[PDB]
Amino acid sequence: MVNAIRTPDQRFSNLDQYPFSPNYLDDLPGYPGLRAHYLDEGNSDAEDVFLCLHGEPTWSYLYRKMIPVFAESGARVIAPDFFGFGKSDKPVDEEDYTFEFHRNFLLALIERLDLRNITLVVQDWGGFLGLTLPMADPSRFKRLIIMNACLMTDPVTQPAFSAFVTQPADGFTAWKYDLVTPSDLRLDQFMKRWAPTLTEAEASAYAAPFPDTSYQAGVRKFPKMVAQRDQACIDISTEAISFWQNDWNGQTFMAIGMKDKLLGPDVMYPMKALINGCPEPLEIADAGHFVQEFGEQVAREALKHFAETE
């Protein structure tokens, strides 16, 4: 039962533009011996809470340009690091990382912190998992900010959410290749390739959580879960579609990183139609898969859109 390692704290000593204080949650229900890190910024007694979920192969550092904007508006911001990433503990075996392992962690976190009036902010795996959370406790969610993401349902139900896996060759195929094949995986080099506008310092922050390959089991497993979806993931993701289509009635805002070869327009437009009340997406021309790197714009416009619909 859950053999995991912890990244030395010194590895985070020289981060670029990450002045956010660490918060930890030990022994969450179903996760004994595991410490999870999360940021808790802005007014702790705020009525609105922005739950920012990251994806592969990043961490809360990805939301560093969005957190200040949300906090300045008077809202509380919660940005957790999934187990295997950021400052959270990292199981050594890939077999321990599953769809429900990460999903149940999010549910436990929300219950432990008793988060309400949540504006769900998602992208990539933050969305694959995040988008399935509201149907479990709908009264806790108020709004949604969705950036490049979708649902991991089966190919028949939604072909658009499976088609990108095989084409184009330089899309998810190259992405997965870059992550699961290198014996010595260098995340600073990976991120510089998939987010060409990052500075050397910023790319370095993405390598910070991983002193060596033994810390990368979660990183290697994520891409494999997009290609091989277990029955639980398919069932949960399918039920989630019905939620956004028939049950959801909250404020929504969508932003698409137009240069993303994985989850761009091909996926985002079909996603827009499935989310009841999702407005016309904000298309960010220069943004790639990691839309949050152009997040100040997304954050500001989302707040403006929300204010005009209360």
Check the CA dihedral 189-193-195-198 and report its sign: positive
Question: What is each CA distance from 216 to 37, 113, 186, in whole angstroms?
Answer: 17, 28, 10
Give me the residue label for tokens 């039920």: 239
CB within 8 A of 235, min separation 6: which ones?
none
Contact 102, 129 (CB under 8 A): yes
Q: Which alpha helices (DSSP H) does 138-186 contain, by range?
A: 160-163, 174-180
Count CA atoms within 13 Å of residue 242 on its CB side: 9
Judging by beta carbons within 10 Å of its beta carbon (0-12, 13-18, 19+), is residue 207 exposed, middle or buried?
middle
- Which tokens sit at 286? 């220069």
Closest CA to 150 of 41, 40, 270: 270
Residue type, 282: L
Tell me whether residue 244 is annotated as binding: no
User: Which letter, b or e, does each residue of 234-271 get, where b requires 16 or more Cβ atoms within 10 Å of its Cβ?
Assistant: bebbbebbebbeeebebbbbbbbbbbbbbbbebbbeeb
Question: What is each CA distance from 56 to 140, 191, 243, 267, in whole angstroms?
Answer: 26, 10, 25, 17
| Resolution (Å) of this entry | 2.0
**Is 54 known to be catalytic?**
no
Long-range Cβ pairs for the range 31-34 (8 Å, 24+): 31/2, 31/83, 31/105, 31/108, 32/1, 32/2, 33/1, 33/2, 33/4, 33/89, 34/2, 34/4, 34/83, 34/88, 34/89, 34/91
Which candidate in 96, 178, 260, 266 is catalytic? 260
The residues pairing with 77 across neighbouring beta strands, listed in sequence order, are 41, 50
**Is 260 known to be catalytic?**
yes
- Which tokens sit at 128? 């694959």
**Rounded CA gap, 254 and 100, in Å?**
26
DSSP tag of 21 = P
**Rounded CA gap, 265 and 288, in Å?**
11
All domains of the chain in start order, with CATH:
1-310 (3.40.50.1820)
**Rounded CA gap, 119 and 298, in Å?**
14
**Is 16 known to be catalytic?**
no
Check the CA dihedral 67-296-138-242 and report its sign: negative
Which candidate in 37, 54, 102, 289 is catalytic? 289
Tell me whether strands 141-147 and 251-257 are parallel, antiparallel or unpaired: parallel
Tell me whether residue 125 is annotated as binding: yes
Check the CA dihedral 101-102-106-109 and report its sign: positive
Which candidate in 89, 124, 178, 266 is catalytic? 124
Phi, then psi, of 297 in degrees rounded to 5: -65, -50
Closest CA to 250 of 149, 158, 133: 133
